Design a binder for these strands. Structure first.
Ligand SMILES: [Zn+2]
Ligand SMILES: [Zn+2]
Ligand SMILES: [Zn+2]
Length: 85
DNA sequence: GAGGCGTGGC
DNA sequence: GCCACGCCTC
């Protein structure tokens, strides 16, 4: 029901927080800044900043159960499993 | 690999 | 709102 009020946009979302995040695409707002040395990246929502920061810290939570290769994202690990079929 | 993004449990 | 999922596109 929550629909973007901008003229050229008709996107509708389920939750209010979803719409709030979408409006940042029109306004160009990005409150979530990466505080690394010289990165300067900014994001409209929380999770991609957290995901990005793992690029700096090498945090690879997702471990492969067959081989010792681990990845920072669940989707990366999923694709890797195809090489084990 | 990595950003952009729809969706949903808490 | 946090944060994960899974997908899309380059
Ligand atoms: Zn819009
Ligand atoms: Zn960064
Ligand atoms: Zn593996």
């Amino acid at each position: 029901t929550h629909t973007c009020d901008y003229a050229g946009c008709g996107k509708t979302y389920t939750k209010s927080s979803h719409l709030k995040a979408h409006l940042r695409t029109h306004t160009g707002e990005k409150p979530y800044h990466c505080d690394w040395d010289g990165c300067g990246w900014k994001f409209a929502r929380s999770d991609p900043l957290t995901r990005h920061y793992r690029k700096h810290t090498g945090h690879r939570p997702f471990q492969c159960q067959k081989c010792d290769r681990a990845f920072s994202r669940s989707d990366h690990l999923a694709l890797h499993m195809k090489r084990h079929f």
